[PDB]
């Protein structure tokens, strides 16, 4: 009896159903065409899902893994080259980037510069790291489930 009552009370304090209901989001890759970045709302913060062309994925390999503050090649970030999914928040002081613009064709944080490439890596600017890459995966050649 005790074990149960204690368990129920303890769990009353963990995430409620309405909260879990927003735990993870599933995006349809079919809605996102190449050369065009799309942003969805996940956990109150912007979620970036860009369809990288075989063209952009190339600009990516041409990156000195050892010439970036947060040294990581596309290899370590994505899963399916044609797909880049980032947390739309600058690593500097929390602002939300602007896609396509910037010195490296990726994203530009209008707060203090912070330029991110097509892979979302800090290039020029105050930001320390590169836009975060949240957990996820794919389901069918048209659905991705971030979170």
């Amino acid at each position: 009896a005790a074990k149960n009552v204690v368990t129920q009370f303890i769990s009353s304090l963990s995430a409620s159903a309405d909260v879990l209901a927003l735990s993870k989001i599933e995006i349809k890759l079919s809605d996102i065409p190449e050369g065009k970045n799309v942003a969805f709302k996940w956990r109150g913060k912007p979620l970036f899902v860009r369809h990288r062309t075989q063209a952009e994925i190339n600009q990516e390999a041409e990156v000195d893994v050892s010439k970036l503050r947060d040294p990581q090649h596309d290899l370590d970030r994505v899963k399916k080259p044609e797909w880049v999914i980032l947390v739309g928040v600058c690593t500097h002081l929390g602002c939300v980037p602007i896609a396509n613009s910037g010195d490296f064709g990726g994203y530009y944080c209008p707060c203090h510069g912070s330029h991110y490439d097509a892979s979302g890596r800090i290039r020029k600017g105050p930001a320390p790291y590169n836009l975060e890459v949240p957990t996820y995966q794919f389901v069918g050649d048209d659905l991705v489930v971030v979170g």
């Binding site: 769990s11 009353s12 409620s16 159903a17």
Partner: protein, 379 residues
């Protein structure tokens, strides 16, 4: 000292009140309610905090925050049930606790008795303000009906009331202060309870035969620790059976409707445990008299210690007092019933009779029959 249960400045306290504490060998089940009341209190505070962590005191979110708690929080519905129904278990236990003391002259322990009356008044205030929080129809109207009674106090009437409301009617500033009060009072109850037991330990417990039990005392543990634990599960069964098989048996369906200041419910009546007082309230047609009669319905308890005439403590060996006692108990069921009925004939007259006999029995008959019985014992 040899054993650390006596030397230590803290255990020593736990020992002299729950282990080596001298208890009468013959106390019955009516003595199980103090501990249940204590456990009852720890449980309300516990389930109360768990609910408070999801509640929002704002007229625009109260109702739904409670709904959100029941619908989304893990076991929110269970906690809400237990807290709500726990309030009744609390009162059931408290009325039996009070009864026991009236029937066995425990009130001759004046301080223990008076702190006890204070505990009851605080418990009521707590339940009253707690009831408003969900902000349903009976929540708001109950608040409205009762708080308006006091504008009837001459002079400081409208003042005291408008001060309490924090405005011109029961509104948001009332809700927020009631939440603060509802969170606060239980802690005052816990504190005063310590005093209650402190005065009690001055004398020790009274027993059913009302004679000195110094000749036969037993340690609280294991006799009463076991007796009380048993008494806990025996009561806890009907409690849970109600909260799990008939969650809304005691509640007003009117409270599943968001409060609406422009729609008076047809029957504004309290929870069962207040009905008897609500009856006495309406018995006196005249705003001021009714309020006083209401107040007195509970404050009357402070006079009991002064109306004891018997030469014997309990009513165990007093047959005339015994029936008068059960008349009283029946009197209260009648008032409870009247309180839940509309204000119409025959209920109106029955109400005034029961209200009138209520005070007669306590103020006039009990002390009178007591004296009478003294003569019949040739004393």
């Amino acid at each position: 000292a040899p054993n650390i249960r006596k030397s230590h400045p803290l255990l020593k306290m736990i020992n002299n009140s729950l282990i080596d504490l001298p208890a009468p060998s013959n106390i019955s089940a009516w003595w199980n309610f103090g501990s249940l009341l204590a456990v009852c209190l720890m449980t309300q505070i516990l389930t109360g905090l768990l609910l408070a962590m999801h509640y929002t005191a704002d007229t625009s979110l109260a109702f739904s925050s409670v709904a959100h708690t029941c619908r989304n929080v893990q076991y929110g519905w269970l906690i809400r049930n237990l807290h709500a129904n726990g309030a009744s278990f609390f009162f059931i236990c408290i009325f039996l606790h009070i009864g026991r003391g009236l029937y066995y002259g425990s009130y001759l322990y004046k301080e223990t008795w008076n702190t006890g009356v204070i505990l009851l008044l605080t418990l009521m205030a707590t339940a009253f303000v707690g009831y408003v929080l969900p902000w349903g129809q009976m929540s708001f109207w109950g608040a409205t009906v009762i708080t308006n009674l006091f504008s009837a106090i001459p002079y400081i009437g409208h003042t005291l009331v408008e001060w309490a409301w924090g405005g011109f009617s029961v509104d948001n500033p009332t809700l927020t202060r009631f939440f603060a009060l509802h969170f606060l009072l239980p802690f005052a109850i816990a504190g005063i309870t310590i005093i209650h037991l402190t005065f009690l330990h001055e004398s020790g417990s009274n027993n059913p035969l009302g004679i000195s039990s110094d000749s036969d005392k037993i340690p609280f543990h294991p006799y009463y620790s076991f007796k009380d634990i048993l008494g806990l599960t025996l009561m806890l069964t009907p409690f849970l059976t109600l909260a799990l098989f008939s969650p809304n048996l005691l509640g007003d369906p009117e409270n599943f409707t968001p409060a609406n200041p422009l729609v008076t419910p047809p029957h504004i009546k309290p929870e069962w445990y207040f009905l008897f007082a609500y009856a006495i309230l309406r018995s006196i047609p005249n705003k001021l008299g009714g309020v006083l009669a209401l107040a007195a319905s509970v404050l009357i308890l402070f006079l009991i210690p002064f109306l004891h005439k018997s030469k014997q403590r309990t009513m165990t060996f007093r047959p005339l007092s015994q029936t008068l006692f059960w008349l009283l108990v029946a009197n209260l069921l009648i008032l409870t019933w009247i309180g839940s009925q509309p204000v119409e004939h025959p209920f109106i007259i029955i109400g005034q009779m029961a209200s009138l006999s209520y005070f007669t029995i306590l103020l006039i008959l009990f002390p009178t029959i007591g004296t009478l019985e003294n003569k019949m014992l040739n004393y």
